[PDB]
């Protein structure tokens, strides 16, 4: 049990103001988040060299590099934790993992690769071929054309990324008699469109969509060497008599075939 | 001797097709080279993260990274070289190592830091302040103003890099009495100008000079793990019984204060 | 080797938060710096008392105290430096020691009696007597009048302190005959003005000079208790996820006869 | 000492008409001579296989072979030399060695590949591209153009070979006002033009120049197994009743890039 | 070391109120001082008989005597200095010894025969003959006439004694042309005039000079039996709750030919 | 040291009125250190001088051994105090003797108990060697040349300290020193030749020569100290006399190798 | 010591009226002289036979013989000198050996092969080719043309022989501006002209120069068996009643290539 190992080595290491555990990856098996769409890799080096494939729609090749960058998230806890072991375990849970997942989800989608940032999916992605658009298309038809444009890369699509307002407008969309185009409220099964998972995320700017062969075209490389640390600490954030629980991990993103990721905007 | 140990272990390890010697480094003591002017460091990592210092001309700081690049040189030979250790040594110094020294010295001095290149000294260097020039100054007096300008970084100058043509046209120079400034041919040999080492090299373009606090402004980081290797060419074509000999080393260059390295040109 | 011992005790003392090594002095009580001009003393106490001589221009006396203050310099290094001991030795080097020497050279020359500052040589210094100026005098001739003025204290002068701009303009100065006063740029290097040592330093304000009997006028009192200390930190809002390496020592400065130090400004 | 051991083994081995001493070459560090410009090598076989590079003016490769050829120099002495060992030591001296260094310099420079001869640098050399000339070029400007043409091989020049009449007329060149241009007689002695070694040699024909990447483009291979030999003889038919002292060595010359050696003639 | 031996015996002997060390004279086992111009000698009695020489302007002889007087200099230090031998050594230094040199120099130059004083050079000295002066003579020309007047004693001058203002205004002497007559600030520092040592000293009154055959005509006699001592004290009422460190020595002065020493004053 | 052994042997050999010590010699550069050295056990010596036409001619000469002597007056109780007698017989007495041999060797005459000195035998500087605009430094260079006409080479320059202070701190028209700053005047070297700056040389006079080959000091050994009480020293004024002295001859084999001159200005 | 041994054997072998000590060479084979420029050799025979090379300006040859001749020099001493061994040692000194050096220098330079003389360097030498002289050339510029003319022999120049007047006139040469053209008295001392040694000697006639490859073109053959000798004598009508001290050595000079020695005369 990850949370019981974590709680045990924190209380065993705590000196009275600092404690630590070696949580080698937070990723299980190494809504959906952006990192659940991508492939996973494991590394002992701070930099990675890889061969990118460029497609003409033939194959050409080039050397690329990715450097490991650090992602960190923290929560404040009652100082009653850290002698009560099963209270500590109830903080090392789904909210601590979901907070870190929302932090990497912004770097993997949007990052401009200079300085402290990762290289983002939206930076490398191919432009949507608007010549596919036809009279009578809905915004749902524009996604169905983008799923086709992925196939020019040899690979096939595996997920869709949207802003939460655009997914709300798409799902409530109505045919001319006053009937839902997804079918009525008791039917459709949350975040699915044309049989692919949707990731509706705040990182995706409004009016923008992204669809791609994410399980094949790109890979998250995890440095291992992730940690949970706990401290008594001074800050501008209600530090009266509290602990801060901090967890952090080191990642890189390798884009093997950027023709298999399509970025577009809706016309309206 | 290094060439003796290399040539011996190359024949001792040789199969019909592959041989190897693992050199710790090609740098003796882990004219002067450009590498003899800079500071030395050792690392296990593929990349270094460091902080650069910018001086207003009170310090400002930024994160930088240097990836450990590979510097390599190779020679074609014939299978007789593996039958004759004197003949191997004659390639493992007079051909291969003489070619690698001029290879790394062009990277450390001139590397435009894209792709497989190091970022070299002449790319980070600060321009010579031409406003320092005075009425009737010589090419020697331009070097004095640049030795002054290095001190605006808090560091003193520690070496001067010239083309051998420009060093000859400086060393044999007389002041207007009819007397040498530095000395006769005994100043062109024994490469010292005003008590600072001169490095005369083909890598410095004619008419360009560089002066700096090199032992304090920058450091070479060496991965260790250099190799000399011999391989049978199954490539054949027109050339029968072909053998390739290769040596390579892995380096990064870190520039901590580029204000301490001045680059300029002589007017003619 | 100091660097090799300091690395051993930094990794052996490391808690995953701090590590410490004791230097019984860096050097200093085993170009020149301001500390080379002054006399040296060794002390086992954190405060000290002394008598100050006050020359009439007979001897008046007063009682003074000096408190031992801390002088500190730091370098930022990557978190991996504690995982690789040759990478630690590669940072415990001459650039660390020269940086502390440039730090104390600011306190010894320009410090104040307030907070953790030392009392600086420029605060106790007596003014230059401009009644000594003759017609057609230069910035060089003004230093000769100040070397005379030090003799009114019963002491002869032992050195001169200038900004690098001011030393450059003095050394490269031309006489009315169209030729150098001091010899050429061979005299800007090898820092001597009329047999006295020149200390050209970025600590000294532009247009200000100081000349004095420094080894008879004042003494640096050294506590020993110098340290190299390593930490995870993020303060002064510089750089994130970085290790700090700190070297520091404890010093007092005593001024026994302030009449033997002259300060002035060049009007030219 | 060499002259001691040679004289002892000559008188020890002597029997009525011949005697011999074996020496591992006469080249130490195993004006300059031609053999000082070239790379050195050591070999245990009377033939060598090597790969030449051609440059279009991209790279191409061809097999070549060099066969080891004999070079010998002799001096005549009176027969009393074999009965007075200090008189032998007085003939085994620097004049005997410098004669062999002058004998091989004619083969390395002008030899044809036929019979008992080396293939020399002037045979393989690329012709000077006379399209580079202008009306009003001096003989020194023609050398500057030839130094530029070496770069089209991707190597750079390392020496210049001239006749002594031609070096004298380059160096001692007087201007229209009666001053010296290319240095005075201080350039003719201590042989340097533009920071490159000049080899003024009577083997080079008058009106002919050669310049190239000699340190990189060609190599001299020495068999070891050289000999000092003494004989009763009456060949050449000059001098009767005499003793012959002979020193001889076995060499091959390998040219790896003939595009890097430029040969031409002056206008005048 | 002297400071090591002095401090160790002071703390060994201290007994809560008085410490003593027997320094058998201070370095005279043998700028300059008056004691460096004169001859030296070693005495075992406190009264001293000697013979003087008078010169008519043949030699005449007369009985004379000198009495050994005491010269003493002191420093005040904090009470902790007797509890820390390194801190005691930091006060037994060159600043202590240079203080006695200033104390003895006023006794040797100006002293009376009366009381605890030595009879000084300015008392025995012959008056400068003003008939030697000529119209518009400089202060240097007066010194030249006075150097000449010493020859009337048969001896020749061996040193010149001036006030620092008078030496400054002799050396920095600048003509109406706007340039130095006597060699300027280089002549002022490292004090030589006409191949004789200048001793610029505060003991010499402004406007007054002394010149003589000091090395031949006069001798300092040293008793041995100097001391370094330490006490708690409250004489002269200056400073309270302080330790006093005393160095004292016993000297006499013998004058053998007073005609060889000239005293005068300047015209202008 | 000498004066250690001399003082204990004087206070020991002393019996009321007489006491005496003898030694096999007492010992910037001195004039004596420029010259060749020889040891002799005779009170006169015969030698041949070489005169060079500027062919060679020869003549007979004699080097008579002369005593060089210095004496001082002291009160009788110096014999009661060994470190005080020692202070006389080196800081008063032995210093003045070294100043006195140097004036004999430089500029004595053959007459009486004098040595004939270097400046007495020396040949005149040829003023026709001077070019227009020559300095005092350039006059030394011409005199270094003029020694070579003797077949010997120059080996030292003898100056007054005034003249050496002028020449050492001499600047060319670029404003650089011709020799150096304090390392010209101290470290007594001019163009690799030793300088001897001595008070015995008249101001404005110079001497340059082949001193190590042109001349030789023949040393007799047996240098001495005597203490005397005998005359009106004691029986009116209670004094005594201390005298110390050494025996030398100087032989000049080739005077054409020694050049004497005076500066133009 | 040599003088210890020479005196101790002269006094021991002196019976009645003559005595002798045997030596080898006077330490050649244990300013520069003419014998320092030449090659050395050692022989047990009183005649030597050798081949001379002649050159067109192919190598032609002729046989030669050289006969050992005596060089002798004497000093006259008093008859006292054999009675006092320290006086004999005082006469066996450097004034004697430098006398012999000046004696052999006059034979080796100027001798004619007739009678008791050697064949000298100036008799065999090649004439200076006055066609080399250019407009506006100084006497120094003529010596540079003669340094070139030596190279036509296949040898480089190794020294220059001048009369001392001519060397003074060349080194102290003054420009129209009143400054030294060659560099002045610092070049007359330290006998170097363009890196070649100068030998100024009274053996060279005024207006004549000689320049050659002396160490490669002629050899002094020394018989060993030299002597120091003492005799009663009366001859040449100079000096009477006087002892003679004589030293002598046996030499031959072999000229292997007279084309390498150049002799000429200055125009004025």
Author numbering:
A (entry chain G), B (entry chain A), C (entry chain F), D (entry chain B), E (entry chain E), G (entry chain C): 76 to 105, 131 to 157, 173 to 383
F (entry chain D): 76 to 102, 131 to 157, 173 to 383
Sentences from the paper on this structure:
Tailed bacteriophages and herpesviruses use a transient scaffold to assemble icosahedral capsids with hexameric capsomers on the faces and pentameric capsomers at all but one vertex where a 12-fold portal is thought to nucleate the assembly. We have determined the portal vertex structure of the bacteriophage HK97 procapsid, where the scaffold is a domain of the major capsid protein. Assembly of this large complex from hundreds of protein subunits requires transient association of an internal scaffolding protein or domain that acts similar to a chaperone and is absent from the mature capsid. The mcp gene 5 encodes a 103-residue N-terminal scaffolding domain (mcpN) and a 281-residue C-terminal domain (mcpC) that exhibits the HK97-fold including a triangular A-domain; a P-domain, composed of a long spine α helix; an adjacent three-stranded β sheet; the flexible E-loop; and the N-arm.
An initial map with icosahedral symmetry imposed was solved to 3.6-Å resolution for exploring the global organization of the Prohead. Our focused reconstruction of the penton vertices had sufficiently detailed side chain density to build a 30-residue model into the spokes (inset), which are composed of residues 76 to 103 of mcpN. This segment of scaffolding domain adopts a helix-turn-strand motif with residues S76 to S88 forming a rigid α helix lining the interior surface of the capsomer subunits, followed by a turn, and residues K92 to G97 adding an additional strand to the three-strand β sheet of the mcpC P-domain. The final model reveals that the density is discontinuous between residues L105 and R130, showing that the N-arm region is flexible. Hence, compared to Prohead II, the N-arm is not visible and the cleavage site, K103/S104, lies in a rather unstructured part of the shell. Our higher-resolution cryo-EM map of Prohead I shows notable differences with Prohead II, including visualization of ~25 mcpN residues bound to mcpC, displacement of one end of the spine helix, reorganization of the P-loops, and a complete absence of N-arm density. Our data show not only that the Prohead I P-domain is constrained (the spine helices are bent and even displaced from their positions in Prohead II) but also that the P-loops at the end of that domain adopt an arch conformation, preventing interaction with neighboring capsomers at the pseudo-threefold interfaces. At the icosahedral threefold, the P-loops interact closely with each other, but in a manner different than in Prohead II, probably because they align with the long axis of the Prohead I hexamer skew axis. The scaffold C terminus binds to both the spine helix and to the P-domain β sheet, which suggests a potential regulatory mechanism of assembly where the scaffolding domain locks the mcps of assembling capsomers into the Prohead conformation, thus constraining interactions between capsomers to specific sites that guide correct assembly and shell closure.
